[PDB]
Design a protein around this ligand. Structure first.
Ligand SMILES: *[C@@H]1O[C@H](CO)[C@@H](O[C@@H]2O[C@H](CO)[C@@H](O[C@H]3O[C@H](CO[C@H]4O[C@H](CO)[C@@H](O)[C@H](O)[C@@H]4O)[C@@H](O)[C@H](O[C@H]4O[C@H](CO)[C@@H](O)[C@H](O)[C@@H]4O)[C@@H]3O)[C@H](O)[C@H]2NC(C)=O)[C@H](O)[C@H]1NC(C)=O
Ligand SMILES: *[C@@H]1O[C@H](CO)[C@@H](O[C@@H]2O[C@H](CO)[C@@H](O[C@H]3O[C@H](CO[C@H]4O[C@H](CO[C@H]5O[C@H](CO)[C@@H](O)[C@H](O)[C@@H]5O)[C@@H](O)[C@H](O)[C@@H]4O)[C@@H](O)[C@H](O)[C@@H]3O)[C@H](O)[C@H]2NC(C)=O)[C@H](O)[C@H]1NC(C)=O
Ligand SMILES: *[C@@H]1O[C@H](CO[C@@H]2O[C@@H](C)[C@@H](O)[C@@H](O)[C@@H]2O)[C@@H](O[C@@H]2O[C@H](CO)[C@@H](O[C@H]3O[C@H](CO[C@H]4O[C@H](CO)[C@@H](O)[C@H](O)[C@@H]4O)[C@@H](O)[C@H](O)[C@@H]3O)[C@H](O)[C@H]2NC(C)=O)[C@H](O)[C@H]1NC(C)=O
Ligand SMILES: *[C@@H]1O[C@H](CO[C@@H]2O[C@@H](C)[C@@H](O)[C@@H](O)[C@@H]2O)[C@@H](O[C@@H]2O[C@H](CO)[C@@H](O[C@H]3O[C@H](CO[C@H]4O[C@H](CO)[C@@H](O)[C@H](O)[C@@H]4O)[C@@H](O)[C@H](O)[C@@H]3O)[C@H](O)[C@H]2NC(C)=O)[C@H](O)[C@H]1NC(C)=O
Ligand SMILES: *[C@@H]1O[C@H](CO)[C@@H](O[C@@H]2O[C@H](CO)[C@@H](O[C@H]3O[C@H](CO[C@H]4O[C@H](CO)[C@@H](O)[C@H](O)[C@@H]4O)[C@@H](O)[C@H](O)[C@@H]3O)[C@H](O)[C@H]2NC(C)=O)[C@H](O)[C@H]1NC(C)=O
Ligand SMILES: *[C@@H]1O[C@H](CO)[C@@H](O)[C@H](O[C@@H]2O[C@H](CO)[C@@H](O)[C@H](O)[C@H]2NC(C)=O)[C@H]1NC(C)=O
Ligand SMILES: *[C@@H]1O[C@H](CO)[C@@H](O[C@@H]2O[C@H](CO)[C@@H](O)[C@H](O)[C@H]2NC(C)=O)[C@H](O)[C@H]1NC(C)=O
Ligand SMILES: *[C@@H]1O[C@H](CO[C@@H]2O[C@@H](C)[C@@H](O)[C@@H](O)[C@@H]2O)[C@@H](O)[C@H](O)[C@H]1NC(C)=O
Ligand SMILES: CC(=O)N[C@@H]1[C@@H](O)[C@H](O)[C@@H](CO)O[C@H]1O
Ligand SMILES: *[C@@H]1O[C@H](CO)[C@@H](O)[C@H](O)[C@H]1NC(C)=O
Ligand SMILES: *[C@@H]1O[C@H](CO)[C@@H](O)[C@H](O)[C@H]1NC(C)=O
Ligand SMILES: [Ca+2]
Ligand SMILES: [Ca+2]
Ligand SMILES: [Ca+2]
Ligand SMILES: [Ca+2]
Ligand SMILES: [Cu+2]
Ligand SMILES: [Cu+2]
Lengths: 715, 723
């Protein structure tokens, strides 16, 4: 013996390197020279900010996928900043038959009913650099006496770093950004090392020369300017607290002081993998779908088919939201609308063996954002099968007949991860062998901290020396366009109630008769459930047709959410993310309603570009193309166990999509992996029980490839 | 490659005793010998016993008092007396009762004490006794010999009644009557399907058997339900049948599909994923102790209460003295008498007593560690459930923590989550409960149960879905609720604990640097829960999103060291209080409750509540009164459950997907930092370093170390029995 080694269209695929190049060429040509690389651009420059796939209309996409009609025009969307103009109108531009582009159309006025104001533009990478020039050259030296005393200020400024805040002002049009100052920690999170200084930078002016500092916050007190502070410091009435710059422990490191022990468990596929990834399609025994990333909206999946039948046209991440409170101006006013940064744009490489199982299939992402040449995130997606170590179904019979019949649960996962400043979002889409789909998101990585000062926990817990863990809420929104056995769908709500009754065979007694309550949700407003409201324990979208037993074929939404209290309606800001107020909502699917948020809401939520609440508009949902909008989130009070990073344990939040009288029986009855044997049969007979042959088939060493990491440069 | 353990399991310090281990084969025998001797002959084997017999029903471990167990485990004092509890049916008596008997220093027993009056303040009425196995058989003798032939004219037309032999089977129901003292049991009749679930094949006939009488001869049938109508007797029916005015619907005798089979018609494809430990396992099971790098605990099964875990220590420090399953509950509704009155208090049967063997590769990962359970229940010799427990490490394929830094400094730091699982499975008639306890490397503990197996069905007749969905031909999937109760005795950094509730609120404010504007100031609300009543959260009430039990002392950062209860529950509407029955499972009405831990309050339920819930033996709500929970030995009672409306996807069995329900126990300012920073398995590397250098990144050496065929043993299965 010498034991051996172990072994449909691309219509939703993200744009390829060539396709991105072809649109940029087309753009530089037909948009008139005078065009700046977005990495270099200034406010008054003309700029291509983003180029990514423009999703096709549903009717044409379906006509192709089902009826066999020709494909709709594959198109791209480009976001262009028009700065070299007296009145800038930032513009949305559709481009070309995209294999060989040939036209261009401005849809800004079409979609948003008017020009997009220039102040809504996301803060460019160059703009961030210009801001640091002002802070470190023009501004911080004015307080170098203070900074020398507190913060180890070196005459060449880079022992400090800045981190952005959130809605840039108090009012539509504003562009004033608080910036915290942190020690530039090497090889670990700086987010835990706030030096106690925040600066309110006004960078609305098209000329960076005219940018000013409106306010200064230092270790618990406000000031008018860095001079106004520095004066009071040298006057002896600004008492510093030394924030150390270096130490040992989790506050300072991610490297463990403990050497590796015996290896942890490892999965492998003893008879080869049981799925394939061809570009943007994944195909398996049971499942079929196309996947991808929106540059700003994030992970998304299309044309999902269980055993050949479409369940859902589109499941896409729509927006993520982090609302903070604190004792300092940065924390108590931060409301991150992360789509304004980009969940796809900030997708980080997946570390083989940590982020996914070692033997997962890792896939690269190509993008064109804030530059002129397209780039790649290596290992942006991972796709893998996971043995849950759990049975999908089971029965063990000792009664009247001796038999066992079960099936271990093995799932198919698709995963992306977005690192947005301090934290890391994980985006799970899990496909179950019962026909159910699962959407779970996780929040890990570093917390956001502030300098600790006279406060009684109204704003968080002390996690380390001089460091306040600022309270905040996470919440995300998902577009779920179910097409349950066709387009036309209805929304059902079923639930329970007890009814007192005389016992039929003894009316002198009283029982409580358990019954099912069922209601058809006719209007959009009946399917809009606010956060905090009582919710039907069974809510499902169903077809007009029936299964074998006469029940409408539906799937059901089941939510795992600990949703936090939403930002009040009184706040002018709330309209920019009014989807937070809901747990779940079903609206008519409409081409002119493709998303619940916009990349332009982050910088101007008071005059929102997209306001989700407008979609809920008093229509019928009885027999239309429906789409479910699910909000999942939770409240996070940071604590000491949250200082290496946030652990994922218990913080996974999301929802299930489960068949409810959609089939005539559970399809895992037909499973090729279901185990069954009688008590009079031989359970060790490989003939009878495939598990008995597992030692023979799994008697091989894996061929697990050499460790690669997708790298990261300095973008 | 390795075959057993690698580098000698763990090296920690001492303090490993099996004071909580279930009784061994020897220990059970010694008590039975002791009982037959000193309890006076006239004693019958429980498997053979009749109502009027004298009977040993159960013998199992009697848990020690906390104070003596702790003094031994910590202070070093001698162990408390290892004892056992025996349930004895006293039938050969003018006034028959059931009695609870403690017995002996249990290595070599020497005494006996009746604690029935001590614990329950009086004798245990005999009608509360669980229905014996022999009692079920006697009922079937009555039904099949004395009773069913009286309607064989009907039965030959509808149901393939063969001569006298059984092709039909009965299934019990739940609270046996309408009133304290009753013992009248509905029995459904089903085709005795071979090799698959009979529960999906209700023939449409239910019989109300009165078996309260100590003499089986005096047992009678009070009522008969057939295909939508009631009758007085099987003769009264059989009359109207031959009279031509009882219209039968043929229920078929046989078929194909999930309605009829569990065997797939599809042959095996390529093997599914498999885990293994490339450098040996990283944990050990010595009897009832489990020990790993991080975790240490003793596990077991109560015969009626079910799975339980004791003396849990993360990195050598106790977090919890006891986490035990307490009771499981299934409340049904239906169009027939059986369904619409069924309220199973499964502890009255036994979650441990009905623990089934774990099939290697389906119920747990193939390479899990399977452990046997010894018991003495309804017999005179102890038996064994082979592979009753499984213990294993599971790579979650999920990171525990992660950061990928592209900003100001190029680094990655993370750790893939690997968990430690302990699992039992209880098959109670139609359904299969899975009992998970998952130990996380963050210091968190997780309790998840699952419900799978066959649904209970009834014969379908004129009904508009008020009681369920039609799942197959002539089969109604009856609506019901699952719910279970957990005793969680946390001792957070000592016995004395307080209960904290933290939650959130927004406060309008003028903007400090622009008072012309308004902000909404996010703040934290915090309240100390002082009285037991403040910590009793009813189902449907609003719950603090942060609720935790904490010590008097503080972590490095001055915060009280606590753990936190986080619940994943979709709990169903509870049985109303207006019902006289509800007192037998009043724990259902709460989501979570914290009470003073007391020796005389060891359990929220009783095996004797199933047959007499109107006069409950244990009434949970009595635990909640006007006592302080500010600085005592506390104990949390967590309820988790959901509503189940059966549907077509539930006809091979119930899938576990999404039906997992339970709660988390997570550290909240208990440590000075997340202990997984110190993980031996944490990955970290800078951008200027070599990620492929094994020196730098242990993952790079994984292909070298995982170049190994496993040594996965030959498949065993734990067999079955005729009980
Ligand atoms: C916060 O503090 C940190 C230290 O405490 C600072 O970290 C330092 O950042 C600099 C700037 O990024 C790093 O640059 C130096 O090292 C790199 C490494 O080069 C190697 O790896 C590259 C992959 O990124 C390859 O592309 C290279 O070919 C090489 O294999 C050098 O690339 C740097 O550039 C040098 O050479 C170029 C070209 O000739 C010159 O233009 C530069 O002037 C320079 O001479 C640097 O040598 C540095 O590694 C890093 N230090 C540590 C210890 O990690 C950090 O800069 C600071 N804050 C900010 C805002 O950056
Ligand atoms: C928001 O702002 C954007 C730009 O910031 C606006 O887009 C501009 O729209 C203007 C009209 O609203 C348009 O202005 C005039 O010019 C175009 C013609 O220019 C286009 O076509 C030429 C081709 O024509 C000949 O001449 C050119 C030299 O100009 C030669 O190179 C060429 O070879 C050919 O012989 C293109 O070359 C050129 O690049 C333009 O695409 C007219 O059609 C208009 O009617 C109008 O008179 C201006 O060109 C647009 N800017 C562009 C395309 O960069 C947008 O309108 C605005 N929207 C709102 C609501 O304010
Ligand atoms: C289930 O829903 C589908 C989809 O339609 C949607 O749901 C229904 C319930 C409504 O809410 C609609 O508003 C939604 O769009 C239904 O599909 C339709 O089914 C029809 C019957 O099978 C079919 O037409 C048939 O009859 C045609 C004759 O027209 C009749 O009506 C006119 C008056 O309008 C009457 O004068 C005339 O005498 C006829 O009786 C005939 O031409 C067709 O060949 C066919 O036989 C529709 O074509 C079809 N819809 C489409 C778009 O094709 C389905 O009926 C629903 N089933 C139910 C409710 O059981
Ligand atoms: C944290 O809590 C523990 C547990 O006690 C519980 O919580 C405290 C806060 C109270 O609410 C108790 O009612 C709860 O049961 C505390 O443990 C206790 O700590 C004491 C201080 O070390 C210790 O007693 C010490 O002092 C004794 C002298 O008695 C003094 O008080 C009387 C007035 O009553 C006075 O006349 C006398 O002159 C003394 O000044 C001494 O005899 C002891 O030997 C010992 O040195 C208690 O024994 C102990 N509790 C128990 C049950 O043993 C702990 O202090 C708290 N820590 C904090 C608040 O930081
Ligand atoms: C409901 O129907 C069930 C089947 O339809 C009945 O199950 C049967 O129950 C009997 C009694 O418990 C059980 O024992 C019988 O078969 C044994 C095994 O068969 C022998 O022969 C085979 C070869 O054919 C050989 O491989 C075996 O090793 C074994 O030697 C006999 O050993 C035994 O003596 C007895 O005859 C049956 O196995 C079982 N049949 C099935 C198909 O499960 C059940 O009894 C009935 N319910 C009630 C309440 O009656
Ligand atoms: C939100 O807007 C509602 C509008 O009806 C307003 O009532 C709330 O303002 C005030 O809240 C106070 C409690 O925090 C209350 O004492 C006061 O009466 C109430 N104002 C009025 C006119 O009744 C607004 N709440 C918030 C949080 O902004
Ligand atoms: C942060 O501080 C540690 C010590 O706390 C530094 O370790 C020092 O390293 C230098 C050179 O590498 C030695 O000369 C010192 O003797 C070390 N000190 C101790 C106490 O071990 C570490 O270098 C510091 N971090 C950085 C980035 O310089
Ligand atoms: C169940 O029946 C299967 C096929 O028999 C079918 O049923 C009878 C009533 C007739 O309608 C006949 O024409 C059909 O073919 C068998 O293959 C199977 O063995 C039967 N199951 C048993 C006997 O347990
Ligand atoms: C066009 C339409 O559907 N209008 C209705 C309106 O008649 C009704 O009063 C309202 C109440 O919900 O809902 C909407
Ligand atoms: C219980 O009885 C009271 C009688 O006062 C009644 O008001 C209440 O509605 C009843 N509850 C239920 C669930 O029937
Ligand atoms: C004490 O218990 C009674 C019920 O007997 C209750 O009404 C009262 O509110 C309780 N008081 C306190 C302080 O717990
Ligand atoms: Ca709408
Ligand atoms: Ca739809
Ligand atoms: Ca109490
Ligand atoms: Ca306690
Ligand atoms: Cu968070
Ligand atoms: Cu159920």
């Amino acid at each position: 013996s010498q034991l051996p080694h172990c072994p449909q269209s691309q219509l939703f695929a993200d744009l390829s390197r060539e396709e991105l190049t072809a649109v940029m060429r087309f753009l530089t040509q037909r948009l008139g020279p005078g065009l700046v690389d977005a990495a270099q651009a200034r406010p008054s420059d003309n700029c291509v900010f983003s180029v990514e796939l423009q999703l096709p209309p549903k009717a044409a996409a379906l006509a192709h996928l089902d009826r066999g009609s020709p494909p709709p025009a594959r198109e791209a969307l480009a976001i262009v900043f028009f700065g070299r103009q007296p009145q800038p109108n930032v513009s949305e531009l559709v481009v070309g038959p995209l294999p060989h582009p040939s036209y261009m159309r401005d849809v800004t006025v079409e979609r948003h009913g008017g020009p997009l104001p220039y102040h809504r533009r996301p803060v460019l990478f160059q703009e961030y650099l210009d801001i640091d020039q002002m802070i470190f050259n023009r501004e911080l030296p004015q307080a170098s006496g203070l900074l020398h005393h507190c913060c180890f200020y070196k005459h060449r400024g880079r022992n400090l770093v800045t981190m952005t805040t959130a809605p840039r002002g108090l009012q539509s049009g504003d562009r004033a950004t608080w910036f915290g100052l942190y020690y530039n920690i090497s090889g670990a999170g700086f987010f835990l090392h706030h030096v106690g200084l925040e600066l309110l930078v006004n960078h609305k002016a098209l000329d960076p020369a005219r940018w000013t500092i409106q306010k200064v916050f230092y270790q618990g007190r406000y000031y008018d300017s860095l001079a106004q502070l520095e004066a009071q410091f040298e006057a002896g009435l600004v008492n510093v607290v030394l924030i150390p710059d270096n130490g040992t422990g989790g506050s300072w490191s991610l490297k463990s002081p403990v050497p590796p022990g015996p290896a942890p468990p490892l999965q492998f596929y003893p008879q080869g993998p049981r799925f394939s990834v061809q570009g943007s399609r994944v195909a398996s025994s049971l499942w079929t779908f196309s996947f991808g990333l929106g540059a700003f909206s994030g992970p998304r999946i299309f044309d999902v088919r269980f055993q050949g039948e479409r369940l859902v046209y589109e499941i896409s991440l729509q927006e993520a939201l982090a609302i903070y409170g604190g004792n300092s101006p940065a924390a108590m006013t931060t409301r991150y609308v992360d789509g304004g940064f980009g969940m796809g744009k900030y997708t980080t490489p997946l570390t083989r063996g940590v982020d996914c199982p070692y033997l997962a299939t890792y896939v690269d992402w190509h993008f064109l954002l804030e530059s002129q040449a397209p780039k790649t995130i290596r290992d942006a997606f991972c796709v893998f099968e996971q043995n849950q170590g759990l049975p999908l179904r089971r029965h063990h019979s000792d009664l009247y007949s001796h038999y066992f019949g079960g099936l271990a649960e093995t799932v198919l996962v698709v995963r992306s991860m977005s690192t947005l400043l301090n934290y890391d979002y994980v985006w799970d889409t899990v496909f179950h062998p019962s026909g159910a789909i699962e959407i779970r998101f996780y929040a890990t990585g570093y917390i956001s901290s502030a300098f600790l000062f006279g406060a009684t926990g109204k704003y968080g817990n002390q996690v380390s020396e001089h460091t306040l863990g600022t309270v905040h809420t996470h919440s995300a929104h998902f577009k779920v366009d179910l097409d349950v056995a066709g387009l036309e769908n209805w929304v059902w709500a079923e639930d329970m109630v007890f009814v007192p009754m005389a016992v039929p065979w003894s009316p002198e007694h009283q029982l409580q008769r358990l019954q099912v309550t069922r209601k058809l949700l006719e209007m959009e407003e009946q399917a809009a459930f606010l956060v905090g409201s009582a919710t039907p324990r069974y809510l499902y979208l169903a077809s007009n047709h029936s299964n074998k037993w006469g029940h409408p074929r539906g799937y059901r939404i089941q939510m795992l959410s600990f949703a936090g209290e939403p930002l009040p309606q009184n706040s002018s800001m709330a309209r920019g993310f009014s989807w937070e107020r809901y747990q779940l909502a079903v609206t008519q699917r409409k081409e002119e309603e493709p998303s619940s948020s916009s990349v332009f809401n982050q910088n101007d939520p008071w005059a929102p570009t997209v306001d989700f609440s407008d979609f809920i508009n008093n229509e019928t949902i009885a027999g239309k193309d429906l789409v479910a909008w699910v909000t999942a989130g939770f409240l996070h009070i940071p604590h000491a166990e949250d200082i290496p990073n946030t652990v994922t344990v218990g913080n996974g939040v999301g929802f299930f999509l489960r068949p409810y009288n959609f089939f005539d029986e559970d399809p895992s009855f037909y499973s090729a992996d279901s185990i069954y044997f009688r008590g009079d049969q031989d359970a060790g007979a490989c003939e009878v029980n495939p598990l008995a042959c597992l030692p023979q088939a799994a008697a091989c060493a894996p061929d697990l490839p050499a460790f690669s990491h997708g790298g990261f440069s300095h973008n």
